[PDB]
């Protein structure tokens, strides 16, 4: 009955899955799909840009974390919690976490560890929803995400 968790896992897992496999899931999103569809479209636009602009930072972090199996995914959860340890929460940090998740998911697929992608998506969702639920709700959840990353075209 935790709709925020379900919706968050749907968006994050869909992005990690399509990034790792290179194939979009052509099923419609679950109900509340307008918001979820827009969020995944926004996440593609922003997340693809983050991975391209910051590939060097992402490759360096991946190389040092040495992610090989599902135990390393759990270790990554500890690190991800520290993304908010200074008391600051914003959508830039949240999308950076998800973007790195996609970056790692692509790595896991290349090393025949696709079974680790779903645990990775769940871990990212766990950190976001189980430790920053209150902030997410204040933003109107994924609607706030869509509206923040909406680039205004004002002629």
């Amino acid at each position: 009955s935790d709709e925020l968790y379900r919706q968050s896992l749907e968006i994050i897992s869909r992005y990690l899955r399509e990034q790792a496999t290179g194939a979009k899931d052509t099923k419609p999103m679950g109900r509340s799909g307008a918001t979820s569809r827009k969020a995944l479209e926004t996440l593609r636009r922003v997340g693809d840009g983050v991975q391209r602009n910051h590939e060097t930072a992402f490759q360096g972090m991946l190389r040092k974390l040495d992610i090989k199996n599902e135990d390393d995914v759990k270790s990554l959860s500890r690190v991800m919690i520290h993304v908010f340890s200074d008391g600051v929460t914003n959508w830039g940090r949240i999308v950076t976490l998800i973007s790195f998740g996609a970056f790692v998911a692509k790595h896991l697929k290349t090393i025949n560890q696709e079974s680790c992608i779903e645990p990775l998506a769940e871990s990212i969702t766990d950190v976001l929803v189980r430790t920053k639920r209150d902030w997410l709700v204040k933003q109107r959840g994924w609607d706030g995400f869509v509206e923040f990353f909406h680039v205004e075209d004002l002629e």
Partner: peptide, 21 residues
């Protein structure tokens, strides 16, 4: 976890980029 601040700073750069968008 020592790498944590790197993620925070990068995330803040991304937030700052879109905040003026």
């Amino acid at each position: 976890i020592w790498l944590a601040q790197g993620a925070r700073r990068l995330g803040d750069e991304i937030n700052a980029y879109y905040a003026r968008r």
